[PDB]
Design a protein around this ligand. Structure first.
Ligand code: HEM
Length: 153
């Protein structure tokens, strides 16, 4: 459970992300795909992309980055009270998209790295630890739904 002070650190940096949702979404998905190429293979929509320049030039990838970060921002702003938001996301990601929890760990690393690059003054160690806790809570709660449905592993 995050404290109020931890949530304030999380949402303070997230308010900075929302100034350029699309650029953050690009940087995060590209980092994910470069650092963990198995993740790109899960996207029929993107797996034709073979270089970082092609990824950066894809408007559709930019659009999807906004989709992803909008969903995450709505979860973070619930401060843990996010059951309604996680139900459909866990269902689609477990049963339709077939995304292991481990890949949610990978995107969480990518998010933290990009926030550190873009917002160092609002993403010191205290905020890094708080965002790591928020993303762990996200994964814990999604993992419980995966387990219900027979997909935790
Ligand atoms: C912060 C974590 C993530 C969030 C908030 C998120 C959010 C979303 C949302 C809102 C959608 C569209 C609605 C839906 O299908 O549920 C979507 C689609 C999808 N996501 Fe995620 N996602 C996350 C992580 C991942 C990861 C790590 C992968 C793959 C490694 C992945 C793969 C997919 C795929 C394949 C689709 C469908 C894309 C398409 O063909 O249109 N997601 N995601």
């Amino acid at each position: 459970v995050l404290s109020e002070g931890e949530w304030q650190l999380v949402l303070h940096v997230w308010a900075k992300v929302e100034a350029d949702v699309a650029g953050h979404g690009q940087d995060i998905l590209i980092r994910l795909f470069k650092s963990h190429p198995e993740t790109l293979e899960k996207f029929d929509r993107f797996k034709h992309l073979k270089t970082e320049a092609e990824m950066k030039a894809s408007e559709d990838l930019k659009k999807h980055g906004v989709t992803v970060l909008t969903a995450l921002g709505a979860i973070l702003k619930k401060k843990g009270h996010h059951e309604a938001e996680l139900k459909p996301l866990a269902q689609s990601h477990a049963t339709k998209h077939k995304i292991p929890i481990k890949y949610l760990e990978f995107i969480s690393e990518a998010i933290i790295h990009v926030l550190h690059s873009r917002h160092p003054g609002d993403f010191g160690a205290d905020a890094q630890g708080a965002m790591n806790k928020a993303l762990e809570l996200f994964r814990k709660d999604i993992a419980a739904k995966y387990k219900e449905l027979g997909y935790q592993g």
